[PDB]
Each structure stands twice: as structure tokens, then as C-alpha cells.
Design a protein around this ligand. Structure first.
Ligand code: ZN
Lengths: 103, 59, 49, 145, 114, 115, 100
RNA sequence: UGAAAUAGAACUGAAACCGUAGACUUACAAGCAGUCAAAGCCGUAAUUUAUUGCGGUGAUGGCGUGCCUUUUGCAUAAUGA
RNA sequence: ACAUUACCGAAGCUUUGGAUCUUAACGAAAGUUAAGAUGGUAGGGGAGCGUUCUGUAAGCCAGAGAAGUUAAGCUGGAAAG
């Protein structure tokens, strides 16, 4: 059993007991998350597809932590112009543990 | 008539390893002393060759 | 340790020039491309060419 | 802890098991036949298609000598080749090339339509063309198409 | 007031060499070649970070088109019906679905054809 | 790695490493008898230099391990590095001079009791 | 092949390779815009749909006077003679919808 | 002997350069040698254990005309190492 | 060529996460929000890293291991630490 769920406009494939890495969510909502926009549910054989959301179907999750990714570097330079620029970056991600898929 | 660009270490290594390669001489143990001598040459250690003395080996 | 605590703006740094591309005062060092002025000079005598 | 990877899935080529497909070329049009063959060979009919690796099936073409053309191509299509020696340009019309090598036109067309590089050459290795209506790969139980 | 201590250039070079480890030939040890190859590599890294989005979307589209080859729905029409029936599922999701669980994707297609 | 009890080292020998390495390749891993025969046979300066170093290494091993004879020994490893260089002048036409480098080599041989 | 001729030919082929479907879409948009402009004293929403790069200087000035700087720019304006004239100048780069 | 002799005519001993050993890859292929994807092999940590990561190698796919200076304009077969 | 419905397709547009600056509002202020605005050579303005010496420093940290290369790991938006 799994769910195809939209969080903040990004699809994910949620499975129970099992973490999701999503875009950083505000400190305000670091307590207990409920997501109401489920696109698809596959339960033990049979599948329900929402138009655009499957009604009466929730996903309940517990916020766990925030974690930074590996560092990336944006670099550019202009040939035979003696000019460049370098910028570092590290994106932040939030990890949520899916408890149950209200099906 | 002059190198246009410095060759890569791969090319230099390849050429050097192929060219600077010496081959082992064949051997055959002397019937007299048991030394390993060059095949078809007088033994340098005892002087015999096919059971015939030819040298008188000194110091 | 008593931290003299200089007033702000009391000493500009300098206009160190010709020390890299990132400083904005790089190879050409504020002089432009070529000509008389690129090489130390300008005809002084209130000159109008 | 375990993370649900919401990333594109890649299927290990050691768990994909290649079949053979028979395609008949009788009374078909050369380009259409070649296009079908390329689509099968490339792997573009499987959900896990990947241009990196070789995941498509193999193809046996039968009756390759009965491909039909339209227009005056039978008299006018030219197959060129160059010996790399000076002036050594040799042409060969469709008639003559077909008579000398019955499988050559279809092999040439499929080679042109396949991608280029090591994988393209491998894909062409994955193809068998027969002039007649019978093939020697009976041991593979090829699926007819 | 002589200000010579040259513990700077070796530092720059050590960082560069650390980042340029696996390169071919003399590009991994010489300072000049390593710096040239690294600098063009980082620019490639930026460009390619933006290109990876295009590449993966193209892959997903091709996979969807392959999974639909069976049925009679050209996937332009598939996207058509998808939007028209108001199913806002994603190209990545559909591509992965057609591999993990083919029958769900097939059911989606039956549902689109309406 | 080295059992430095069993090894010989010859520093600044009068030959170029580029010329001594092939002879080393021909005896690496061979038995002591075979290697000694090869070096005696082959009429190369590097061959004679290796012969001296190899014989010395075997002598050291025997001296420190009295129950090891000439026919349980095999040449385990052989390394040939480059040593000091000397520059001398070779004068050419039109007053042009060229510098004429003379190279030396270090030789390291370790023997070991055969399999 | 002579360079003068091949440049002419390449340019002519590029120009002639336009799609009638795209032309029909553009014609439909123009008709809609003219129909809207023909009205009088209504609030109209103006979207900018074509870029400012490469266009004429006068027309860039008109668009910046309407308030649109980028593609995707949204501005509501009250149709009087001034706005009608500006819209007529820049009709080919805008999309007009009506604010009920 | 000396605290040390990879302190023995020399302290700390890098880079360029020359090597040895082990692991991986390579002899049907047209690679500014890199980046983005990626099977297999090897090292390693977790999850009861062969599927996920830190790693090193990398078949194959996509993209990509070294750099500096000078010019209306250079991968340019303009200049310089 | 003429019609109908589409889709693909850029660093454009939209959305998500993060940073700086201008203006405006709120706030005692710090800052919090709203709006837009940030390709860029010549060239102008502004903000920092790092090296050596001097006062701080007859301070603090070192033979229980200073300085320096050297392997690995980590942080910072860049100089880097
Ligand atoms: Zn003898």
C-alpha cells in the first residue's frame, strides 16, 4: 500500500513507516503534519485516482529534523575578460516520518 | 624537424618500455659442473664443453 | 586588553590597484587600454592637443 | 530508518532477459520496416527504456528480398562507397546491389537509422537479416510480429 | 617590514590539487593544467546542473511514451485526456509508476481514454 | 614491508636507471640460481651491477639465517631508482656549448626464502 | 556556391518556414485584442506576452509607460483615449482580458 | 656510540621528475580529456544481510572549440608560456 | 496548400526553499512583512578575507611536542577557516 501525495506542490510517493525528504518546512510546523492532497492510493491490489484529489484520504506524519545537503558551487568566468564569480550553496531539507495513510 | 608538442607520459612510457627490452639468453646446465651455461657456449665456470676441455680458467 | 575602539570612517583603507581580477582594479589598474595615458604620462602644459 | 527514494528508477541490466522478435518484410515499404526494427531494437517499447544501456530485444528480419519501394527508386536510388584511394568512388544502384547482396539494402537502412557510437554498433550486432523466408534461430522460439 | 612568508601559494595549490584528484595525465598534478581543467569543470558543473532538469524530463517523457506503445493512445492525447479529466499527477511519478506497478498506470490510461 | 635483515642496497652506481631497469625486469621473481646465471651471461653494465648487489643481498640473508642455502632463495623484489647527476660540457661549432649529463642509479634488492 | 546567394537563400528559407497554425493563433489573438480595444470606459487587464528585447525604442518606451517590464506582467487600466492609443501602438505584444 | 644513524659530511626535505607493489578498467575504437547520468568490480559503515550511503575505479549515454594578451570580430592557422 | 484538436520545446513565465539590496509599512529600536531588483567589459562607489612587523603581549599556548609541508574529515555566500 502506498500513496501518491502532493506537498507544497511537489509529488511524492509516501509509504508507511518510512521517511520523506521534502523542502524545508517552517519552524512553526515542526510538530505534527496532516496532508490532505492525495493524488492516488494503491491499497493491497486496488487503486483509486483523484480528480484531482482522492476524497476522505489523509496522510499523517511526524516532523523529525532538518538536514543540509552536499555543498554545490556556482562558478562562471568570461574568457579573456579577466572576470568571474563564485558562489557556494547548501540547500536545506526536512525529514518527515509517515505514520498512517488514511485510505 | 622538431617536436611540435611535448608527448604524453603514456606515449613516452610505451615507447621506452617497448624499445628498452632485452631478451634472456637460453640456458642449459653443464654436463660436468652443473652450472647453468649459455646454450651452445663453452661453460665459463669449468671450461668443459660436450665433455671436452677448451679453456684454462684462472682467478 | 582594552580595545582602543577607533571611530568609524577615521581611516580609509587605500586604493590598492593591480592586485587581481576580483578587486575591480585588475590588470589594467584603472588606466584604460592603451595610449599616452596608459604609460605614466600626460602632456601637462594645460595642453589642448 | 529508511528513505523512500522519489527518484527516477534504473533497472539493473542483469535482471532483464532478452527475447527475439521475428519481423516479416514481405510487401512492406523499406523505410517503414526499418523504423519498426529500430524501435524494437532500441528498447523504446519497454517502460524502463534507457539510452545509457542495452535493454531492448533482438530482431530477426525474414523475406528481406521482397521489400517494395515506391516511385522510380528501383532504378534511381544510388548506394555510394569510397575505397579511400584517390578517385575510388564506386556507386551501385538498388537493382545491382540487391542482386549481389539481397540483405544489403535493409541492413544499410537500419544501420543509418540506428544511433551512432559503441551502443549503436552493439544494437546493430543485435540484428539478424535473412533473404528468404526461413531462419536458423529456431532454438530461441522468436515471437512473431 | 619585508612580508615574504610564502605559506599562501602552496595553500591555493593544495586545495586545487585536492579537488582535481582523478584527472587524466598531467592534469592531476601540475598546477597550471590542474587549474585550467578545474575552472572549466566548475563552469560545466553549473551549466549541467541546469541541464539535468531537461535531461530527466526528456527521459520521463520517453518512458511514458514507451509504456503507452501497447494501447492506442498517443501520449500527446494521453496528456490531453489527463489534463481534461483533471488528474494533476507528474511526469516523474507516471514514469516511475509504469515500472513499479504497471497495472495502476494501465488503469489510469483506461480512465483517460474517456 | 622490507625485512631489512635480508636486503642489499647499492647507491650511486655508474649507470643510468633507464638502462638498468630492463635487466631488473628479467630477473624479478626468478630463483637465485637462475638470476645469477642470467646476470653472469648477459654482457651489460647494468647486469654486472645487479649481479654484485644481488650476490650481496643473498650473502646477508645467509649470514643472518644460517639454515638458508643458495637454492631456497628467490629474488623477491628489485627496485632501481635514480641517483646524483653530474654535468660536463661538450663544445660544438660556432662557440656553442652543450651540457652533458651523467646519471647514476640506486639499486635495491631483497631476497626471500622460496615458496 | 556563391556566398551572396547562399546567405539570401538561407534567410529566405528561415523566413518561409513559419507554421500556419501559429499564424492562426496569432490572428485569433489580434482579433480578440481589437475587439476589446473597440470598447470604451471599461477596466481591462493587460498581460505582457512578448519580450522587450530587440523591439523598437519607441515601443519599449510605450510599454514601460503602460507599466509592463517583463513577460508575465499584470496591470489593470481604465480604458480612455490615452490608454487606447498606447494599446493600439503595442497591440501585437499584449493580451487583453476584461475585468468584470 | 647517541634521545634519534629513513641524524653517517649532514637540520625541517615539498613540488616538478623517476619508481615499486596492490585494486579496478582497457586491445571495434574517432574523448579540449571535463561535467551531468549510469551497470559491474573492489574497500567500508548501517539496516539481520544484500538492499541503501560514505568511497576509489569506471563499460555506456547526453552536453561541451585550452588559456592569456590584443581586436568591430578569434578554437582560430594573431600573440605568449 | 487550406481546416479541427493538441503536444513537445529556453537559465522566459508560474510554484517551492534560501540570501542580499532599494522603497514603503509595522515596531522604542533591533528587526519583522509588502512591493521590485540584482547579465555585464571600460570605469565609479562600497563591504571583507589573508600575510609580515609593532603596541596590547614580562599576556596566553608549546618538549606531556612550537613552526612547516602531509593524509582524511568538517564549516563559511566568496576570498577561506
Ligand atoms: Zn661447466
Amino acid at each position: 500500500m502506498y500513496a501518491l501525495v502532493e506537498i507544497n506542490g511537489k509529488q511524492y510517493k509516501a509509504i508507511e513507516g518510512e521517511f520523506l525528504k521534502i523542502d524545508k518546512i517552517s519552524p512553526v510546523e515542526k510538530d505534527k503534519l496532516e496532508f490532505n492532497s492525495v493524488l492516488l492510493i494503491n491499497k493491497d491490489g486496488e487503486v483509486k485516482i483523484g480528480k484531482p484529489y482522492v476524497v476522505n484520504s489523509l496522510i499523517r506524519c511526524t516532523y523529525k529534523e532538518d538536514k543540509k545537503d552536499k555543498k554545490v558551487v556556482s562558478y562562471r568566468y568570461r574568457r579573456r575578460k579577466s572576470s568571474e564569480r563564485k558562489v557556494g550553496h547548501r540547500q536545506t531539507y526536512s525529514y518527515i516520518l509517515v505514520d498512517e495513510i488514511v485510505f | 624537424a622538431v617536436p611540435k608538442f611535448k608527448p604524453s607520459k603514456s606515449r613516452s612510457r610505451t615507447r621506452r618500455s617497448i624499445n628498452m627490452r632485452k631478451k634472456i639468453p637460453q640456458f642449459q646446465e653443464c654436463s660436468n659442473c652443473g652450472n647453468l651455461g649459455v646454450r651452445h657456449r663453452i661453460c665459463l665456470k669449468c671450461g668443459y664443453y660436450r665433455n671436452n676441455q677448451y679453456l684454462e680458467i684462472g682467478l | 586588553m582594552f580595545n582602543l575602539l577607533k571611530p568609524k570612517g577615521a581611516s580609509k583603507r587605500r586604493k590598492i590597484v593591480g592586485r587581481g581580477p576580483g578587486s575591480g582594479l585588475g590588470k589594467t589598474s584603472g588606466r584604460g587600454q592603451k595610449g599616452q595615458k596608459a604609460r605614466n604620462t600626460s602632456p601637462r602644459l594645460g595642453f589642448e592637443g | 530508518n529508511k528513505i523512500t527514494n522519489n527518484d527516477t528508477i534504473w533497472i539493473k541490466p542483469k535482471t532483464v532477459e532478452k527475447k527475439w522478435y521475428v519481423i516479416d518484410a514481405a510487401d512492406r515499404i523499406l523505410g517503414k520496416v526499418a523504423v519498426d526494427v529500430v524501435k524494437i531494437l532500441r528498447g523504446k517499447h519497454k517502460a524502463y527504456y534507457t539510452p545509457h544501456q542495452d535493454l531492448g530485444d533482438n530482431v530477426i528480419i525474414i523475406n528481406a528480398s521482397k521489400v517494395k519501394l515506391t516511385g522510380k527508386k528501383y532504378q534511381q536510388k544510388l548506394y555510394y562507397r569510397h575505397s579511400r584511394y584517390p578517385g575510388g568512388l564506386y556507386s551501385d544502384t538498388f537493382r545491382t546491389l540487391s542482386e549481389r547482396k539481397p540483405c544489403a539494402p535493409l541492413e544499410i537502412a537500419i544501420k543509418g537509422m540506428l544511433p551512432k557510437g559503441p551502443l549503436g554498433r552493439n544494437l546493430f550486432r543485435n540484428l539478424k537479416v535473412f533473404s528468404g523466408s526461413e531462419h536458423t534461430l529456431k532454438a530461441q522460439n522468436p515471437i512473431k510480429l | 617590514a619585508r612580508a615574504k612568508n610564502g605559506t599562501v601559494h602552496v595553500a591555493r595549490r593544495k586545495r586545487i590539487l585536492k579537488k582535481t584528484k582523478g584527472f587524466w595525465g598531467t592534469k592531476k598534478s601540475n598546477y597550471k593544467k590542474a587549474k585550467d581543467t578545474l575552472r572549466k569543470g566548475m563552469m560545466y558543473a553549473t551549466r549541467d546542473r541546469k541541464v539535468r532538469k531537461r535531461d530527466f524530463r526528456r527521459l520521463w517523457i520517453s518512458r511514458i511514451s514507451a509504456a503507452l506503445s501497447d494501447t492506442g493512445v498517443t501520449y500527446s492525447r494521453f496528456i490531453e485526456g489527463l489534463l481534461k479529466s483533471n488528474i494533476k499527477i507528474n511526469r516523474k511519478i507516471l514514469s516511475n509508476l509504469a515500472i513499479e506497478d504497471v497495472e495502476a498506470f494501465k488503469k489510469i490510461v483506461l480512465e483517460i481514454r474517456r | 614491508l622490507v625485512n631489512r635483515r635480508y636486503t642489499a642496497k647499492g647507491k650511486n652506481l655508474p649507470s643510468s636507471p633507464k638502462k638498468v631497469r630492463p635487466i631488473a625486469d628479467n630477473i624479478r621473481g626468478e630463483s637465485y640460481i637462475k638470476a645469477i646465471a642470467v646476470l653472469c651471461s648477459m654482457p651489460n653494465k647494468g647486469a654486472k651491477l645487479l649481479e654484485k648487489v644481488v650476490k650481496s643481498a643473498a650473502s646477508n640473508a645467509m649470514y643472518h639465517n644460517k639454515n638458508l642455502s643458495e637454492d631456497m632463495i628467490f629474488v623477491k623484489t628489485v627496485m632501481v631508482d635514480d641517483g646524483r647527476r653530474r654535468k660536463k660540457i661538450w663544445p660544438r661549432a660556432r662557440g656553442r656549448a652543450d651540457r652533458l649529463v651523467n646519471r647514476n642509479c640506486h639499486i635495491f634488492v631483497e631476497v626471500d626464502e622460496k615458496k | 556556391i556563391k556566398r551572396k546567394l547562399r546567405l539570401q537563400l538561407k534567410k529566405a528559407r528561415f523566413n518561409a518556414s513559419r507554421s500556419r497554425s501559429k499564424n492562426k493563433c496569432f490572428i485569433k489573438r489580434m482579433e480578440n485584442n481589437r475587439k476589446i480595444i473597440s470598447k470604451n470606459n471599461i477596466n481591462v487587464q493587460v498581460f505582457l506576452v512578448r519580450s522587450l528585447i530587440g523591439k523598437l525604442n519607441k515601443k519599449v518606451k510605450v510599454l514601460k509607460a503602460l507599466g509592463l517590464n517583463k513577460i508575465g506582467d499584470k496591470k489593470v487600466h481604465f480604458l480612455n483615449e490615452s490608454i487606447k492609443g498606447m494599446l493600439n501602438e503595442t497591440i501585437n505584444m499584449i493580451l487583453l482580458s476584461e475585468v468584470m
